[PDB]
Amino acid sequence: MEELTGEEVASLHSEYVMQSWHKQGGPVKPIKKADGIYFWDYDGKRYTDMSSLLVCSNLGHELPEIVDAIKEQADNMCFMAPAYASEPKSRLAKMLVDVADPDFYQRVFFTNGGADSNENAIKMARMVTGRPKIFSCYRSYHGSTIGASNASGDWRRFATELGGSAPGFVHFMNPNMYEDGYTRGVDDATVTADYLHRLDEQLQYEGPDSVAAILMESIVGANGVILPPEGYMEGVRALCDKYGILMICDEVMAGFGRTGKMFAWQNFDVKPDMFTFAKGVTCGYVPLGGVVVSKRISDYFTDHVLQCGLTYSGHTLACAAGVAAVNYYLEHDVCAHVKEMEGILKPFLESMVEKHKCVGEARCIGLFSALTIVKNKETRELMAPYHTPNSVMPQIMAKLMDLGFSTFGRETNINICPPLIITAEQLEEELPKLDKVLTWVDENLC
Amino acid sequence: MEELTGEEVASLHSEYVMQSWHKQGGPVKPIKKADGIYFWDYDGKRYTDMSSLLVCSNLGHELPEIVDAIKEQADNMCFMAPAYASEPKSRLAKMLVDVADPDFYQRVFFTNGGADSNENAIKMARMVTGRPKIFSCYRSYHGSTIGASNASGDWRRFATELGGSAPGFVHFMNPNMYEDGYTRGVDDATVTADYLHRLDEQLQYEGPDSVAAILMESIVGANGVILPPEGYMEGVRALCDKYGILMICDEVMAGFGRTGKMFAWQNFDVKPDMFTFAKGVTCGYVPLGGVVVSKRISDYFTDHVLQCGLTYSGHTLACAAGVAAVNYYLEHDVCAHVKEMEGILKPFLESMVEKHKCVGEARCIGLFSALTIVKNKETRELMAPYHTPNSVMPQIMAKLMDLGFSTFGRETNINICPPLIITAEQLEEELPKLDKVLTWVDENLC
Numbered sequence: 051m052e053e054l055t056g057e058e059v060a061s062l063h064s065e066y067v068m069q070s071w072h073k074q075g076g077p078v079k080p081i082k083k084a085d086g087i088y089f090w091d092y093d094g095k096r097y098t099d100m101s102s103l104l105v106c107s108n109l110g111h112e113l114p115e116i117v118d119a120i121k122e123q124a125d126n127m128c129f130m131a132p133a134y135a136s137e138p139k140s141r142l143a144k145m146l147v148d149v150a151d152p153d154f155y156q157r158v159f160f161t162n163g164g165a166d167s168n169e170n171a172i173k174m175a176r177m178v179t180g181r182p183k184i185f186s187c188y189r190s191y192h193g194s195t196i197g198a199s200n201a202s203g204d205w206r207r208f209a210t211e212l213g214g215s216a217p218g219f220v221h222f223m224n225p226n227m228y229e230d231g232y233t234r235g236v237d238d239a240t241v242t243a244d245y246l247h248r249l250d251e252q253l254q255y256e257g258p259d260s261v262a263a264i265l266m267e268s269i270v271g272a273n274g275v276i277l278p279p280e281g282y283m284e285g286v287r288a289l290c291d292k293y294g295i296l297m298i299c300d301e302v303m304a305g306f307g308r309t310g311k312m313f314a315w316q317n318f319d320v321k322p323d324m325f326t327f328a329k330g331v332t333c334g335y336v337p338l339g340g341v342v343v344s345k346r347i348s349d350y351f352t353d354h355v356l357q358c359g360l361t362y363s364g365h366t367l368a369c370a371a372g373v374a375a376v377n378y379y380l381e382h383d384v385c386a387h388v389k390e391m392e393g394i395l396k397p398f399l400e401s402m403v404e405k406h407k408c409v410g411e412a413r414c415i416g417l418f419s420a421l422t423i424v425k426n427k428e429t430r431e432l433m434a435p436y437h438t439p440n441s442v443m444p445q446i447m448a449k450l451m452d453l454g455f456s457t458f459g460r461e462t463n464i465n466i467c468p469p470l471i472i473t474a475e476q477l478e479e480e481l482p483k484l485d486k487v488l489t490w491v492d493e494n495l496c
Numbered sequence: 497m498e499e500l501t502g503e504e505v506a507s508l509h510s511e512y513v514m515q516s517w518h519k520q521g522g523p524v525k526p527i528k529k530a531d532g533i534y535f536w537d538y539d540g541k542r543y544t545d546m547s548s549l550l551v552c553s554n555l556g557h558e559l560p561e562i563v564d565a566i567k568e569q570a571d572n573m574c575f576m577a578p579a580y581a582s583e584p585k586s587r588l589a590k591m592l593v594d595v596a597d598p599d600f601y602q603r604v605f606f607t608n609g610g611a612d613s614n615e616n617a618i619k620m621a622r623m624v625t626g627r628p629k630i631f632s633c634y635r636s637y638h639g640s641t642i643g644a645s646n647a648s649g650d651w652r653r654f655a656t657e658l659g660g661s662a663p664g665f666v667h668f669m670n671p672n673m674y675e676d677g678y679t680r681g682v683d684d685a686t687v688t689a690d691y692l693h694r695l696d697e698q699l700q701y702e703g704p705d706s707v708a709a710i711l712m713e714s715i716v717g718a719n720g721v722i723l724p725p726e727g728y729m730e731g732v733r734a735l736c737d738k739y740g741i742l743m744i745c746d747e748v749m750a751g752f753g754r755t756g757k758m759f760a761w762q763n764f765d766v767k768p769d770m771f772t773f774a775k776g777v778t779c780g781y782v783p784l785g786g787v788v789v790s791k792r793i794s795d796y797f798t799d800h801v802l803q804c805g806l807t808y809s810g811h812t813l814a815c816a817a818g819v820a821a822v823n824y825y826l827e828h829d830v831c832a833h834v835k836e837m838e839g840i841l842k843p844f845l846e847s848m849v850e851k852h853k854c855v856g857e858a859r860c861i862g863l864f865s866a867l868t869i870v871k872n873k874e875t876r877e878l879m880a881p882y883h884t885p886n887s888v889m890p891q892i893m894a895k896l897m898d899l900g901f902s903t904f905g906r907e908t909n910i911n912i913c914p915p916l917i918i919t920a921e922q923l924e925e926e927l928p929k930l931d932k933v934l935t936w937v938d939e940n941l942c
């Protein structure tokens with residue numbers, strides 16, 4: 051082939067590619083290769099993927115087991131239509147029900163990504179219950195297509211709402227303990243009592259008989275790893291039981307080992323009626339998402355036609371990578387390694403709280419972590435208040451990117467979501483870089 | 497693990513897989529392998545893929561050029577994030593702009609499939625024009641997610657409408673010449689004049705200044721290869737020009753050689769402001785879709801933030817498969833071969849009209865074709881009128897499947913959309929199976 055130079059790759063991109071969530075034509079980094087927890091630009095500089103790209107490359111890059119499964123499947127059958135059974139699609143559905151809970155869940159509806167599966171979970175909840183309304187969090191992101199974007203809490207919904215908001219999407223405010231003035235640990239029962247009651251009250255004023263589902267990120271991800279107050283998720287599950295509302299957990303970012311469990315909702319003593327997934331089901335190697343449905347929902351669509359579908363549902367190549375990814379998580383006890391890696395990451399960030407005036411809070415479950423950056427520790431003034439213009443936080447990400455610490459954040463947060471295969475030696479080598487950049491912020495942005 | 501038997505693969509699917517557009521748990525055919533224009537169940541029976549699966553496997557199955565590109569990309573880098581340029585993504589955007597028209601189009605917005613590309617095309621049209629409303633045809637399908645399904649005409653939208661129609665989606669009736677009582681040879685100028693005036697009048701009664709886009713399949717596909725009357729598509733383009741409305745053509749099904757041209761809208765004297773694609777950009781081998789946008793639209797999003805995005809946009813593996821597919825279409829002059837195969841398929845289907853009491857009309861452009869099945873040639877009584885319960889058409893589809901002639905249809909139609917690589921000899925072997933089955937319909941369903 052006519053292999054392109056680094057400059058041509060970034061040149062053509064700036065000129066011909068439509069970039070997500072940006073204005074067109076900026077400068078762009080051209081990436082040549084990735085492997086393990088690293089990737090390289092065409093100048094040869096190495097970046098350590100401390101955010102797993104978009105918290106999706108859970109097993110690092112170029113994992114032989116997934117790469118090999120893909121190539122093997124490509125030699126058999128890259129795609130076969132949804133109307134037919136295939137080995138990878140059959141095996142992955144069983145594996146997913148099994149790791150989720152084979153006594154509660156029954157079927158998996160395969161999709162292309164995250165927005166795709168939230169869209170279909172919404173449609174399925176309205177069909178099963180006969181009710182029109184969907185409750186979702188203001189502090190949440192569920193996708194960019196009109197249905198998932200209407201359910202999404204953060205301001206990316208504003209553009210989708212051009213022409214009008216979609217009917218039946220009611221938003222309720224969920225607690226962000228630090229930003230709301232409280233202190234995790236001490237105040238959990240107070241915040242949980244307050245926000246569970248706010249939600250109960252809003253349900254009553256919307257008519258609980260008309261609310262088909264409550265949809266929640268298992269742990270709010272892109273918007274800052276907002277660990278909920280203890281007991282909050284169980285109370286939501288309790289409200290759903292009281293009112294006949296289905297509970298839908300969004301596992302797109304927090305699933306597949308991110309938190310130390312296969313699914314983040316497994317940290318809570320709740321069985322959601324449905325939950326949605328994508329990123330780590332294949333570590334991003336082939337697009338795949340899905341909906342895991344309870345036995346009750348499975349039964350409903352045995353009697354009624356499931357009015358859902360998409361050309362690539364259960365894509366064969368994609369599922370083959372899924373089988374390899376899931377088998378890797380299990381055979382290599384990746385959750386246990388993630389729980390143990392928590393022991394290096396969590397104490398480190400907590401000490402960044404004590405050591406840095408610009409770091410107000412640290413949250414960490416497994417390798418799912420974030421820092422709240424503040425302009426003023428004493429007043430809790432955020433370094434970038436909600437939906438601020440000219441947030442300085444990209445500036446901070448660029449200082450990090452300069453040391454080979456690649457990550458991202460939204461609002462006033464820095465995420466730290468390294469690949470689940472990262473080692474203690476590797477963490478202890480990268481985290482000093484985060485401390486160095488935090489010091490720069492201390493001295494330049496307060 | 498241990499390879500699964502056919503009976504194990506079909507059992508696990510029936511028990512654990514969520515099937516699109518069906519009640520759960522039925523019987524299912526397990527497919528073991530695919531190659532060229534065929535695929536095989538686990539007993540070894542061969543099916544000739546006369547519908548290209550979902551009119552997507554444009555270059556057949558396991559085509560070495562795409563298979564190999566996939567493996568080569570998997571050995572380098574399966575995925576790299578949207579914020580980075582990658583060789584396959586830059587090369588595919590330029591190649592796509594180039595085959596579409598480099599003097600008119602500028603950028604490509606990559607998605608995972610067809611539905612999200614229509615979702616995003618809608619979002620962009622509302623952002624670019626500042627207007628809320630989308631016009632689309634009642635006889636159309638654009639996807640199943642809330643946005644694309646509200647834009648879709650056929651009854652699969654009704655489920656999405658649980659909870660309410662999303663605002664700003666106005667539907668207009670497009671002509672199906674045969675089903676409306678006219679004749680494609682002698683009647684186009686009247687039908688075109690009438691339906692353009694109906695659309696103009698409806699645009700006027702909705703406020704043309706409030707219509708951001710008219711969205712239409714270049715040639716209505718899954719709903720029956722409904723070739724438009726002469727001059728209709730050009731007149732739609734004229735109304736858009738008159739009123740400042742963007743024209744969005746959906747090439748998801750009719751793109752990539754299906755009709756004898758690279759894009760079906762290229763059979764008409766129109767350049768759409770945007771057009772959407774999925775299936776044949778990769779022949780389904782890896783999920784990929786997109787929006788090709790004009791220079792004007794690209795300019796808008798140079799000055800304004802493109803508030804669209806998805807985790808897997810510009811997926812690296814998927815794009816590598818795309819580069820190989822598009823290069824094949826061009827290097828092997830697949831369009832020219834499709835035109836010459838049109839010269840076999842069109843006369844055969846036309847001769848099925850003359851030969852069978854049950855065949856009212858034949859439509860065919862390139863290898864994009866369908867038969868209208870009737871209970872009564874004289875009264876034009878359809879064999880399955882719109883949205884009938886207990887359609888007998890699956891019976892016909894099954895009689896065909898029994899001869900190894902695998903296809904599908906919607907409403908009262910049988911599609912014939914074989915892979916673009918099918919040869920004259922192969923056509924001469926398969927088409928007799930369609931003739932045999934039509935005789936059975938003649939004698940058993942009128």
Ligand SMILES: Cc1ncc(COP(=O)(O)O)c(C=O)c1O
Nearest residue numbers: 163164165192193302303806807
């Ligand atoms: C928690 C969560 N849900 C849903 C999504 C949307 O997923 P996708 O990009 O695959 O449409 C994302 C991606 O940011 C996410 O982080």
Ligand SMILES: Cc1ncc(COP(=O)(O)O)c(C=O)c1O
Nearest residue numbers: 360361609610611638639748749
């Ligand atoms: C013309 C057209 N547009 C859009 C779609 C939806 O595409 P997808 O199933 O990839 O989401 C289809 C699928 O049949 C289609 O035929």
Ligand SMILES: N[C@@H](CCC(=O)O)C(=O)O
Nearest residue numbers: 070071578579805806807
């Ligand atoms: N995370 C963004 C991509 C980021 C970027 O394009 O700068 C997405 O949803 O695609």
Ligand SMILES: N[C@@H](CCC(=O)O)C(=O)O
Nearest residue numbers: 132133359360361515516
């Ligand atoms: N047409 C369906 C095919 C699956 C089926 O018929 O079961 C789809 O969009 O996935």
Ligand SMILES: N[C@@H](CCC(=O)O)C(=O)O
Nearest residue numbers: 131132133549902903904
């Ligand atoms: N029966 C066609 C299409 C099946 C489907 O609609 O999923 C085939 O697979 O060849």
Ligand SMILES: N[C@@H](CCC(=O)O)C(=O)O
Nearest residue numbers: 103457458577578579580
């Ligand atoms: N923030 C991620 C991804 C941005 C994108 O999706 O392009 C990174 O910097 O690696």
